[PDB]
């Protein structure tokens, strides 16, 4: 059973909008409030500005609390600002930002003053999703309530989404321009862009059926003896010292939810092993068979002869086998 999440790289475009209210006393200055908000970056700004020009506006316009709010960095006019790489941190993914210092209002004697700092931040984050893959979470602990595989093509629009359809924009034929090398990639990809209330996430879209794999290749057994006894099949491997018991009937692979991956991986590994070890002495006997073993193990088996819909739940304990 594939307990590992489906992992993929995403990019969070958002503007950190910090409004600080400062009170200036006679001999001191005190913060009377620091409103920090995260604004999504619009699609017209991710495609036209960030991806093409490598810049970002000095304003954030976003819907917060059922209001259209527009925040101007340093309270001055909107200007395009270059994205510079973030300060290096250990074990940290790449990130870029426009502004590096928090703007706070200039001193005036005995007056509360409000000062806005809009920092356009672009972070490459790891995003992960679990079955039924109707939601995925970014590395920043933010949940995104859309299937990773939501899109436009060939039934990839019936995938779950919890946002209005005006918040999603799959820019087909997307040319990624790295913000460090400033080099535009040649091979196009389908770019999904979801503008959540707090940020915008972009990820390269892939079809769901060949991208997920509800089973995971756990062991590749060169020599797995199969025997029939007591109306059941025993698959014994001396290499890993493990014996599984299955019903005599084959397991219909169509019954595995999201299961096109199992056949492909099994055939690839099986052909590789056959080429490596059994090409010169044995011959394959029929097409790969699939059996379900107690504990929830899916054994793909290729018999050899010498020339002479549901989810499978797998136990965490192999020591029974």
């Amino acid at each position: 059973e594939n307990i590992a999440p489906y992992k993929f790289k995403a990019t969070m475009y958002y503007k950190d909008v910090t409004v600080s209210q400062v009170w200036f006393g006679h001999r001191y200055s005190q913060f009377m409030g620091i409103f920090e908000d995260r604004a999504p970056v619009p699609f017209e700004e991710v495609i036209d500005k960030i991806n093409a020009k490598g810049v970002c506006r000095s304003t954030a316009k976003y819907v917060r609390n059922n209001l259209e709010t527009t925040a101007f960095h340093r309270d001055d006019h909107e200007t395009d600002m270059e994205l510079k790489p973030a300060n290096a941190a250990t074990r940290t993914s790449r990130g870029w930002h426009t502004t590096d210092l928090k703007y706070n209002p200039s001193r005036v004697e005995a007056f509360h003053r409000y000062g806005t700092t809009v920092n356009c931040i672009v972070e490459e984050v790891d995003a992960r999703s679990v079955y039924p893959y109707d939601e995925f979470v970014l590395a920043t602990g933010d949940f995104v309530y859309m299937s990773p595989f939501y899109g436009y093509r060939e039934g990839s629009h019936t995938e779950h989404t919890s946002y209005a359809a005006d918040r999603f924009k799959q820019v087909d034929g997307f040319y990624a321009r790295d913000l460090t090398t400033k080099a535009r990639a040649t091979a196009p990809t389908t770019r999904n862009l979801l503008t959540t209330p707090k940020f915008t996430v972009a990820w390269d879209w892939v079809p769901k059926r060949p991208s997920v794999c509800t089973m995971t290749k756990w062991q590749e057994v060169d020599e797995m003896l199969r025997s029939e006894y007591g109306g059941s099949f025993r698959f014994s491997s001396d290499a890993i010292s493990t014996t599984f018991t299955t019903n005599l009937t084959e397991y219909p692979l169509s019954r595995v939810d999201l299961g096109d991956c199992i056949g492909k991986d099994a055939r690839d590994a099986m052909d590789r092993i056959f080429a490596r070890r059994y090409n010169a002495t044995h011959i394959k006997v029929g097409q790969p068979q699939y059996y379900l073993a107690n504990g929830g193990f899916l054994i793909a088996y290729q018999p050899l002869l010498s020339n002479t819909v549901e989810r499978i739940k797998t136990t965490s304990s192999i020591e029974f086998a």
Partner: antibody
Amino acid sequence: TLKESGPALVKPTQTLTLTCTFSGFSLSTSGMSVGWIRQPPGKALEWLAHIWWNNDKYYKPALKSRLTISKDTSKNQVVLTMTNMDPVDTATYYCARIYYGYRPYAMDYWGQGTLVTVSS
Amino acid sequence: IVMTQTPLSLPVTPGEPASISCRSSQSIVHSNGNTYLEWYLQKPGQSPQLLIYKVSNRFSGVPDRFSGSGSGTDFTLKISRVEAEDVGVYYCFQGSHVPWSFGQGTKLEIK
């Protein structure tokens, strides 16, 4: 079925608005797309624009600054707008339906097309 | 992706096979792993109709005479037995990557 409709004569340097009426689909289903294509007389097919059910407009980059496709599902229509018309823009415009939502082939159902001449 | 259809005019006697080739500046292979190339046929005073989709698949309403092939940036429509009804202009259209475009088209003539 789709039916394109627009002024048959627009003078140069003006905006032309067209309209495509549908039948058998509304542009609010999960995967429906509607596209506009022109064809100058005697020339090959030139794609212009296409809009998905979620107001996701795609244009021709050459004509992107001039083309504006909008979708009004209340009247079940798509309006294609193209400003600063030039005599080169004289063409027959076709409204098509795209099954990329559902099938791997686009532009199955075309309208009869409307012929527009750009002249004063 | 730029589609150039060759030739621009293909006169073929009825009964003989015909081949039409059109190339794309870059690969039309999509991230899906499927190539979205469609062939269209515009007849005189008629709206175009799809003939071949996904390179090697024929749309319903199209006779077995038409057959598509090719890969990468080279694609070829092929009519095993050209008939009189095949008169018209043929277009190859890439749908994989935005923006989409048609080829320059080939006019089939019957000799």
